[PDB]
Write an enzyme that holds these catalytic residues in place. Structure first.
Site, PDB file in Angstrom:
ATOM      1  N   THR A   1       2.021  16.029 -19.984  1.00  0.00           N
ATOM      2  CA  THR A   1       2.739  17.011 -19.120  1.00  0.00           C
ATOM      3  C   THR A   1       3.304  18.118 -20.005  1.00  0.00           C
ATOM      4  O   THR A   1       3.849  17.856 -21.076  1.00  0.00           O
ATOM      5  CB  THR A   1       3.867  16.349 -18.317  1.00  0.00           C
TER       6      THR A   1
HETATM    7  B1  LIG Z   1       3.231  14.129 -17.441  1.00  0.00           B
HETATM    8  O1  LIG Z   1       2.054  13.795 -18.185  1.00  0.00           O
HETATM    9  O2  LIG Z   1       4.395  13.641 -18.128  1.00  0.00           O
HETATM   10  C1  LIG Z   1       3.151  13.515 -16.030  1.00  0.00           C
HETATM   11  C2  LIG Z   1       4.235  14.134 -15.169  1.00  0.00           C
HETATM   12  C3  LIG Z   1       4.293  13.419 -13.797  1.00  0.00           C
HETATM   13  C4  LIG Z   1       5.590  13.830 -13.073  1.00  0.00           C
HETATM   14  C5  LIG Z   1       3.064  13.757 -12.930  1.00  0.00           C
HETATM   15  N1  LIG Z   1       3.306  12.049 -16.081  1.00  0.00           N
HETATM   16  C6  LIG Z   1       2.249  11.235 -15.913  1.00  0.00           C
HETATM   17  O3  LIG Z   1       1.099  11.628 -15.702  1.00  0.00           O
HETATM   18  C7  LIG Z   1       2.555   9.735 -15.940  1.00  0.00           C
HETATM   19  C8  LIG Z   1       2.148   9.071 -17.230  1.00  0.00           C
HETATM   20  C9  LIG Z   1       2.847   9.656 -18.301  1.00  0.00           C
HETATM   21  C10 LIG Z   1       2.173  10.460 -19.233  1.00  0.00           C
HETATM   22  C11 LIG Z   1       2.859  11.033 -20.304  1.00  0.00           C
HETATM   23  C12 LIG Z   1       4.225  10.800 -20.459  1.00  0.00           C
HETATM   24  C13 LIG Z   1       4.901   9.993 -19.541  1.00  0.00           C
HETATM   25  C14 LIG Z   1       4.214   9.419 -18.469  1.00  0.00           C
HETATM   26  N2  LIG Z   1       1.707   9.139 -14.906  1.00  0.00           N
HETATM   27  C15 LIG Z   1       2.189   8.498 -13.829  1.00  0.00           C
HETATM   28  O4  LIG Z   1       3.384   8.342 -13.586  1.00  0.00           O
HETATM   29  C16 LIG Z   1       1.229   7.996 -12.959  1.00  0.00           C
HETATM   30  C17 LIG Z   1      -0.089   7.802 -13.371  1.00  0.00           C
HETATM   31  N3  LIG Z   1      -1.042   7.297 -12.487  1.00  0.00           N
HETATM   32  C18 LIG Z   1      -0.657   6.981 -11.188  1.00  0.00           C
HETATM   33  C19 LIG Z   1       0.665   7.178 -10.804  1.00  0.00           C
HETATM   34  N4  LIG Z   1       1.593   7.689 -11.709  1.00  0.00           N
END
Ligand SMILES: *[B]([O])([O])[C]([C][C]([C])[C])[N]C(=O)[C]([C]C1=[C][C]=[C][C]=[C]1)[N]C(=O)C1=[C]N=[C][C]=N1
Ligand SMILES: *[B]([O])([O])[C]([C][C]([C])[C])[N]C(=O)[C]([C]C1=[C][C]=[C][C]=[C]1)[N]C(=O)C1=[C]N=[C][C]=N1
Ligand SMILES: *[B]([O])([O])[C]([C][C]([C])[C])[N]C(=O)[C]([C]C1=[C][C]=[C][C]=[C]1)[N]C(=O)C1=[C]N=[C][C]=N1
Ligand SMILES: *[B]([O])([O])[C]([C][C]([C])[C])[N]C(=O)[C]([C]C1=[C][C]=[C][C]=[C]1)[N]C(=O)C1=[C]N=[C][C]=N1
Ligand SMILES: [Cl-]
Ligand SMILES: [Cl-]
Ligand SMILES: [Mg+2]
Ligand SMILES: [Mg+2]
Lengths: 204, 196, 212, 222, 226, 233, 195, 195, 196
Positions: free
Chosen positions: I1
């Protein structure tokens, strides 16, 4: 350690032409020690039959529980519970213990008294319903039972022929499992008669 | 640690901070991470101080013996010796090394050798814990065939930011210029590079 | 597994079951748990199938080499000690073996050695080895005498395995009988438990607990 | 941490007839929930009228078959082109397996052929080398599904003769090659239905005095 | 499990395979993974089977009571909100991975739900162990302004990709079409590309083949009169 | 035993009527960091074989050197090195397969998944897989890592069984491969837009295409997606 | 504690239970009676974790004695066994479960039949002709499978019980310091003082 | 194995060693002699891990018998004990150490004195008037502290040994199936067949 | 993110990528991480999708109820509600949120709330896994009182680099402009921002 394979045991159910069959072994053990050869796993509430595998204390507890619930049902409804309705009652009752579940593998079998339609169903330990047309299997030799049923079974078998098929499915599956055997019972179920047969099998 | 090497028109320049840390204690604030394996083949060291020193010492030995037999080695050759040690002893080493050198035939060259022991020839390279914070800056600001003065400014500004954000990086910014003219050492103190 | 062997007037009786398991899965009901080392020596198998087979088959090669070199039948004592010394070299590595080495020589008489992958080597009159060893011990200890006929001794061994086959979940299949005498061993057939149980129940008046 | 073992799935089946022998196996190869190949041969002609399959971890399975094929080649060199009998091949495989007792070949091995009297033969092995001649054996992932069916339909277990009621057993009449292939096909169709790692195709190798023949049949690809 | 959802011109379609599995065994060959929350709100479920059923029934029940309380047809966002908040409360331990779709007075909608309670919006979605095989098909063939016929074709093709390539999916394709201003049509076993072939042999036994010890009539009737 | 550090993602491939196609992106990842953007992961051997490698890049470079050394060694005392006794794809594969299984058997593996694509002397198509465990298999379509989950499904729609190979042209096959690379860029978090593709035909020989990009991407529909459920603005 | 046995014959139920109490390295007592009378024609022997055994047995005893007074009536062995099973089946999902295994031997005065029930700490009940808890069954069940006959007299039952104890004393590693034997029949409960 | 005792009196050394061999749940043998004669006037009893005990004892036996033949002379009990200690002290830092504890009872024909040595698996040697290995000492040392006088006769030593075995049979949990007793004096080694 | 919020002359602009990942699989390539808790108070979400949604939903509820009673809440008030949830439930949450809003009295404001639950008022803020790679770039290129067009270019270039280097970031760049004029949504596709 694994609750579902301390005591051991199996149950199988099948459908035929205007009939159903349910069968189970008689063994109860403490792991390697064989304790009892008279532990039946099939119970009935009216014309609805329930077979239960898994941890034996839960098998007994659930039997007593479904006797309790089906008796209250009958008093209030003024009729015997049907296989379709009972199936839903088992699913409800198991899921309420989602995070502290009964370690069992129930199997429902019976003929609907109004429609005459043969009915069978299986469950996992937490409530999920498997409503198969052909057959249902459960217990420590479920893999073996799946193999036997999948090869031996054909649809629309007459009651006396269905007996042979289900009996051979159970017997040969039990003989490939260390925690199953020590006797066997088969129920043949028609719309208004039920025959119970004890099978002669190897006692090791 | 914040280390980098950048090729330019007249050759190549190596850059580094001077901080060595045992956890949060700075065990040495005036460290020299730019080290010499041959007259005009130097390297930047990151990771374990003991490992990278032991490796650098062995490479200097190998190139000194190469020179005695076959004459001046290429920068590619020096990188290969670094690789051979890092790859074959990957299980027991923690070393992230950038090899930089100046030939007359090949001019300025830069090879980066991360943890695995892989080799990557690049126009410029960045490494060390502080390098993470300047991928964006360096990618946007790097041009090929820069001048000496422009390249010094590029490294000075880049490492300044890496130091600013990384706790493991700090102290003075050391640099080493490699050209046909010779070998020049540069130093830049906090009062200078912090106000950038 | 249930394996037993005992000394008596008419030599030695050896009896074993036939079952092999992988967890709760019954892998085989037709396993040959008695190794015919030579016309005079038998070895029983319990624990790891491969460990027991391999090393007891190997064992016969060492004995054959002994009698080729020494022009004389190997003793049961020397026989058992070759096996025990071998497994002691592997101690810690994870071998899994429970064995009887049974035989008869002029100098020793009928002899049984218990040999173990821990290195344990024990001479003795009666031994039961395996997961169902406790069940077999019950029948043996209450009915054992030195003055038994070959016919009665064979049945006691057969009956002791049957007892364990019934109760122990990891024993069963069939019973292999051997009788070891002055002139060597004699095989006394494969007996299916599925048929033997009902036969014994009816004739002996035992197992009144079970319905038939 | 590195894990030197893996599981490529699959299932194999050997049946011995009166004057013939078959060794079958599905052609699917997998890791976890993915299919690697829908046709990757698993049962091999090793020469001297011997067929072999080593089911489980394919890397160990291929290695073992390769080393046994090699053993057959050197048996011919060292002993004047003598035919390696099925019983001799079995004992040789035991030593190949036990040679790696403390770092095992993670496979369930089965070989098939004819014995020295011309009668059908099947031998079965565990990963560390224990072996036994058998009339019938299924191995691999769906072995637990197939063996009980073979106890019933090949050895007539728990079957008796009508009218006598449990007194007289069903006689153990011999099975033809056409009758055995029917049981093999049904075994794999049934296994495919209830085991996710079984499917795609079925390849059977039949062994007679005349030599080694092959037959292939489609299986469900889901 | 392979479940998908695809938006189109005048509504939304969802689909699913029919395989349930315990480890490497198939528990049910013709399992029903399309659940009805309300007449025109349906969702497909992956993960723990008892959970996807239970959480759907509970929310479907409360949705019905809400619909009666408000005198309005239920909305997809209501089902979405009630599902996510329930799942979040149970911190992922209720293993339900849902694709929620439907038509309501606001329009046609398509959402996904994960066990921890996170929701996502999209024109095309897929969940389960065969989602990667399905999403590959969707990413290759999806376009804007799909017709009803095209969307059913795309949806079932995405499920087929799961059926054939993923070992956690198989058997049949179930579909449910939800068009605006129309009844939702639930197409159970829309495709049946996995019928078993005839067996080589019949295994019907001769009567008397099994040995019996005792026989007896079982009294299933009540206590009798006279 | 080790852990992989600098890593390479999917390698994808298939057969067609007159030969084989193989492809792989140009990225060297350092965990979540997309560190190195100019890494070639398809390595040709002669004019009849291409070896595609995924996994640890240091181990890839070691394997690259082994293959380079294999060509040199085959030329030694070999007048037919560029003719009858040239290196076949089958020879190159079996060598790697031997090394991979030996290294896993010493508990010190080369942390890779490898696909050897090529054409034999008799014109036959060669395509086979091998990985860190020494596991090998062949199939009309082969893919590693994420490609196995996403590319294979798409490629199997073109060539589902053996009988579909003669019916598949080179144009149709390349189209399918290029599409699969686009899908992987949409959905693999450790992939890049830049990639290399190689074709080995029995008639036209070895064609090696560098600096290819994923194009014709669909993103316009993103503008209409707002919030995560109830949000409208 | 260690070994508890039970056998149902023609007209009575016989329970045998070891006398030793071992805490660690020493045998603190060699005359311990591991049983409680629940009612005049119902006896319960027990074995399990220290403390839990007696606490559970006396808790059951108190409850059955309370029932007897309230109704002026003795519960059937079947009814008592079902009550006990439920308490253990309730217990197994508690914060700290009762770690106790029991045998319930009783004479049903209505049916004029002896009855033996075996229940473990999970709440697993079975009616048997002969039973045992712990490692005892591993030695004794083979003997009972051979000799038992349903129609044995009480004297024949005691002889078969002596054969079981002799085997245990021969093959078990732990010295359990012999057993206290008690008979349950139509006339009530009595202890065999010489065994 | 389990219990091994030793006591040095006026003119002899008496060793007592249990007969039981237990592997797991069953007692495979009840007549096992846990001792080896190293020389005509030197006896060694042993206890420890299965296999290692016999293997070690016979290995020592072979070495001392080799010395006897080579020099045509019997080593002193002190000399034999020192050899044994060194082998165990070497063993403890090996890949797989010998897990064996021993008592060495011998009569020194030069000094005309009985001698008892206690050595554990680490190579810890002590000369004692009375000794024991394992849990045996926990029960027996208190009795020996009270009764032992150093001028006792052999008959008085056997009576004091009977009192030790009686206590063990009373308070130890494991049934060790009695003991085999052996006496070492000027005339050599002999076994007391009735004990 | 990769998420950021930047104040400028006319107000504040929020920016974000569109990638959601389950390990290395992109579970959604067109995600909207810019979410609305009030008319002119929005937030950027990073960390757990479930946690940040659950939190955002609760905040929207709290501000809707605040509005009904006390009228339009300040951006400081909105940040405080976010904090109260994040701090008091720090043990069970994984959420990194940036709060941005436009008052007429206070103009553009930005509050960042990292894992702990602490609040930090800043001229601009960056967050998410991809933010590490643009600390150097953003620090060197941020000015106060920029124009709308300049601020859009600053965010577009910044997130472009964060996407380029971070595997967890990608897809389209979404933006939301908050001024007195109203609320404007912007989108920028890969073909546009990659060639920068
Ligand atoms: B981003 O990469 O931090 C993103 C922001 C979120 C609000 C959409 N987080 C995610 O994609 C998270 C995993 C993650 C990645 C990097 C740091 C922290 C967390 N994914 C999920 O929460 C997720 C993944 N698959 C299904 C449902 N939720
Ligand atoms: B730099 O921070 O990576 C630096 C480079 C080194 C060559 C001087 N490394 C160190 O300071 C290391 C610790 C470390 C920090 C960050 C990443 C990896 C390693 N320190 C030492 O090796 C050290 C510390 N104290 C005494 C001796 N050596
Ligand atoms: B017996 O139970 O010890 C038996 C004897 C063996 C020689 C066939 N062993 C086994 O069945 C073992 C498992 C086992 C069960 C109980 C105690 C100890 C070990 N099985 C195997 O060795 C084996 C070999 N090949 C295939 C399956 N199982
Ligand atoms: B699919 O593969 O995700 C499928 C969807 C489900 C709604 C039918 N899941 C299952 O089949 C699950 C997989 C699973 C296995 C083990 C633990 C948790 C989940 N299976 C079951 O829910 C299941 C398994 N056996 C009996 C009943 N239900
Ligand atoms: Cl340094
Ligand atoms: Cl989100
Ligand atoms: Mg700093
Ligand atoms: Mg000591």
């Amino acid at each position: 350690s694994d609750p579902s394979s301390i005591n051991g045991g199996i149950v199988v159910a099948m459908t035929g032409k205007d009939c159903v069959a349910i069968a189970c072994d008689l063994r109860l053990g403490s792991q390697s020690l064989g304790v009892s050869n008279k532990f039946e796993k099939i119970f009935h509430y009216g014309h609805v039959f329930l077979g239960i595998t898994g941890l034996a204390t839960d098998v007994t507890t659930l039997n007593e529980m479904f006797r309790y619930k089906t008796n209250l049902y009958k008093l209030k409804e003024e009729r015997a519970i049907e296989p379709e309705t009972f199936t839903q009652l088992v699913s409800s009752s198991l899921y309420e213990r989602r995070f502290g579940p009964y370690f069992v593998g129930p199997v429902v079998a019976g003929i609907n008294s109004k429609s005459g339609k043969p009915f069978i169903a299986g469950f996992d330990l937490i409530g999920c319903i498997d409503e198969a047309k052909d057959f249902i299997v459960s217990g420590t030799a479920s893999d073996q039972l799946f193999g036997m049923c999948e090869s031996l079974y054909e649809p629309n078998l007459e009651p006396e022929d269905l007996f042979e098929t289900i009996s051979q499915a159970l017997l040969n599956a039990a003989d490939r499992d260390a925690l199953s055997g020590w006797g066997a019972v088969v129920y043949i179920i028609k719309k208004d008669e039920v025959v119970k047969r004890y099978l002669k099998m190897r006692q090791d | 640690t914040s280390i980098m090497a950048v090729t330019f028109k007249d050759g190549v320049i190596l850059g580094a901070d001077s901080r060595t840390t045992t956890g949060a204690y700075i065990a040495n604030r005036v460290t020299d991470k730019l080290t010499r394996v041959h007259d005009k083949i130097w390297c930047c060291r990151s990771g374990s101080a003991a490992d990278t020193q032991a490796i650098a010492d062995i490479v200097q030995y190998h190139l000194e013996l190469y020179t005695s037999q076959y004459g001046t080695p290429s920068t590619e050759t020096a990188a290969s010796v670094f690789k051979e040690l890092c790859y074959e002893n990957k299980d027991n080493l923690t070393a992230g090394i950038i090899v930089a050198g100046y030939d007359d035939k090949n001019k300025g060259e830069v090879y980066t050798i991360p943890l695995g022991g892989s080799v990557h020839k690049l126009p410029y390279a960045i490494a060390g814990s502080g390098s993470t914070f300047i991928y964006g800056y360096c990618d946007k600001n790097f041009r090929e065939n820069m001048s000496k003065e422009e390249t010094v400014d590029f490294i000075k500004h880049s490492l300044s930011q890496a130091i600013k954000w990384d706790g493991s990086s700090g102290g003075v910014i050391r640099m080493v210029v490699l050209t046909a003219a010779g070998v020049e050492r540069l130093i830049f103190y906090p009062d200078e590079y912090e106000q950038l | 597994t249930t394996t037993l062997a005992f000394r008596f007037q008419g030599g030695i009786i050896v009896a074993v079951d036939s079952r092999a398991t992988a967890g709760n899965w019954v892998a085989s009901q037709t396993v040959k748990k008695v190794i015919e080392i030579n016309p005079f020596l038998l070895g029983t198998m319990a624990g790891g199938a491969a460990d027991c087979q391999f090393w007891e088959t190997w064992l016969g090669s060492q004995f054959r080499l002994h009698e080729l070199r020494e022009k004389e039948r190997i003793s049961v004592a020397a026989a058992s000690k070759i096996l025990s010394n071998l497994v002691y070299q592997y101690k810690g590595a994870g071998l899994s073996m429970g064995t009887m080495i049974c035989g008869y020589t002029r100098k020793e008489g009928p002899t049984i050695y218990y040999v173990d992958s821990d290195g344990t080597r024990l001479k003795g009159d009666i031994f039961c080895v395996g997961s169902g060893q406790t069940f077999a011990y019950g029948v043996l200890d209450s009915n054992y005498k030195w003055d038994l006929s070959v016919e009665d001794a064979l049945y006691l061994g057969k009956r002791s395995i049957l007892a364990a086959a019934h109760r122990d979940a990891y024993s069963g299949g069939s019973v292999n009988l051997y009788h070891v005498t002055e002139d060597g061993w004699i095989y006394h057939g494969n007996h299916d438990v599925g048929e033997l149980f009902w036969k014994v129940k009816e004739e002996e008046g035992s197992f009144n607990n079970v319905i038939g | 941490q590195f894990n030197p073992y893996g599981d490529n799935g699959g299932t194999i089946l050997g049946i011995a007839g009166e004057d013939f022998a078959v060794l079958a196996g599905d052609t699917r190869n997998i890791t976890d929930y993915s299919i690697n190949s829908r046709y990757e041969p698993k049962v091999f002609d090793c020469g001297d009228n011997i067929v072999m399959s080593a089911n489980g971890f394919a890397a160990d399975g291929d290695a073992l078959v390769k080393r046994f094929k090699n053993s057959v080649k050197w048996y011919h060199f060292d002993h004047n082109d003598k035919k390696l009998s099925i019983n001799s091949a079995a004992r040789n495989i035991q030593h190949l397996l036990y040679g790696k007792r403390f770092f095992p070949y993670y496979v369930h091995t089965i070989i098939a052929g004819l014995d020295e009297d011309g009668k059908g033969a099947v031998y079965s092995f565990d990963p560390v080398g224990s072996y036994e001649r058998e009339q019938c054996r299924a191995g691999g992932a769906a072995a637990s599904l197939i063996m009980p069916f073979l106890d019933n339909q090949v050895n007539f277990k728990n079957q008796y003769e009508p009218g006598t009621n449990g007194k007289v057993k069903k006689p153990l009449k011999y099975l033809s090659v056409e009758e055995v292939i029917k049981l093999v096909r049904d075994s794999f169709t049934s296994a495919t239905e209830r085991h996710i790692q079984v499917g795609d195709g079925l390849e059977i190798l039949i062994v007679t005095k005349d030599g080694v023949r092959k037959e292939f049949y489609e299986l469900k690809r889901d | 499990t392979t479940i998908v959802g695809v938006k189109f011109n005048n509504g939304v379609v969802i689909a699913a395979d029919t395989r349930s599995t315990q480890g490497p065994i198939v528990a049910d060959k013709n399992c029903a993974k399309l659940h009805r929350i309300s007449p025109k709100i349906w969702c497909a479920g992956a993960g723990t089977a008892a959970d996807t059923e239970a959480v759907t029934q509970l929310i479907g029940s409360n949705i019905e009571l809400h619909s009666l309380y408000t005198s309005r047809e239920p909305r997809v966002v209501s089902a979405l909100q009630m599902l996510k908040q329930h799942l979040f409360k149970y911190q992922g331990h209720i293993g339900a991975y849902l694709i929620v779709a439907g038509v309501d007075p606001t329009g046609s909608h398509l959402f996904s739900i994960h066990a921890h309670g996170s929701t996502d919006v999209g024109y095309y979605l897929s969940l389960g162990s065969g989602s990667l095989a399905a999403m590959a098909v969707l990413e290759s063939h999806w376009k804007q302004d799909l017709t009803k016929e095209e969307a059913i074709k795309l949806a079932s093709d995405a499920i087929q990709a799961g059926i054939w390539n993923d070992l956690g999916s198989g058997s049949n394709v179930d579909v449910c079409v939800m068009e605006i201003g129309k009844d939702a049509e639930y197409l159970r076993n829309y495709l049946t590309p996995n019928v078993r072939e005839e067996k080589q042999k019949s295994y019907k036994f001769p009567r008397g083949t099994t040995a019996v010890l005792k026989e007896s009539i079982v009294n299933i009737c009540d206590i009798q009169e006279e | 035993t080790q852990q992989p550090i600098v890593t390479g993602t999917s390698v994808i491939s298939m057969k067609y009527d007159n030969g084989v196609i193989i492809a792989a992106d140009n990225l060297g990842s350092y965990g979540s960091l997309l560190r190195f953007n100019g890494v070639e992961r398809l390595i040709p051997v002669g004019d009849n074989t291409v070896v595609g490698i995924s996994g640890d890049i240091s181990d890839m470079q070691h394997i690259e050197r082994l293959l380079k050394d294999l060509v040199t060694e085959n030329a030694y005392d070999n007048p037919l090195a560029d003719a009858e006794e040239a290196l076949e794809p089958s020879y190159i594969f079996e060598y790697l397969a031997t090394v991979m299984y030996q290294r896993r058997s010493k508990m010190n593996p080369l942390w890779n998944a490898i696909i050897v694509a090529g054409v034999q002397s008799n014109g036959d198509q060669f395509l086979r897989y091998v990985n860190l465990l020494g596991v090998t298999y062949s199939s009309p379509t082969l893919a590693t890592g994420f490609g196995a989950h996403m590319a294979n499904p798409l490629l199997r729609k073109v060539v589902d069984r053996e009988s579909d190979i003669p019916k598949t042209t080179v144009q149709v096959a390349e189209e399918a491969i290029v599409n699969a690379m686009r899908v992987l860029y949409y959905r693999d978090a450790r992939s890049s837009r830049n990639f290399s593709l190689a074709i080995i035909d029995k008639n036209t020989g070895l064609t090696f295409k560098k600096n290819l990009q994923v194009e014709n991407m669909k993103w316009d529909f993103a503008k209409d997606i707002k919030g995560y459920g109830t949000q409208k603005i | 504690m260690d070994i508890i046995l039970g056998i149902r014959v023609q007209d009575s139920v016989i329970l045998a239970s070891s006398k030793a109490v071992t805490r660690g390295i020493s045998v603190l007592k060699d005359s311990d009676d591991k049983t409680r009378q629940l009612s005049p024609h119902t006896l319960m022997s027990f074995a399990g974790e220290a403390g839990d055994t007696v606490q559970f047995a006396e808790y059951i005893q108190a409850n059955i004695q309370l029932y007897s007074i309230r109704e002026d009536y003795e519960l059937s062995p079947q009814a008592v066994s079902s009550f006990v099973r439920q308490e253990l089946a309730k217990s197994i999902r508690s914060r700290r479960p009762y770690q106790v295994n029991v045998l319930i031997g009783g004479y049903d005065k209505k049916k004029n039949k002896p009855e033996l029930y075996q229940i473990d700490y999970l709440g697993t009940k079975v009616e048997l002709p002969y039973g045992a808890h712990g490692y005892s069954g591993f030695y004794t069940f083979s003997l009972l499978d051979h000799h038992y006959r349903p129609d044995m007299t009480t004297e024949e039952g005691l002889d078969l019980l002596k054969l079981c104890v002799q085997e245990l004393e021969k093959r078990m590693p732990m010295d359990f310091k012999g057993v206290i034997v008690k008979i349950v029949d139509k006339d009530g409960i009595r202890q065999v003082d010489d065994f």
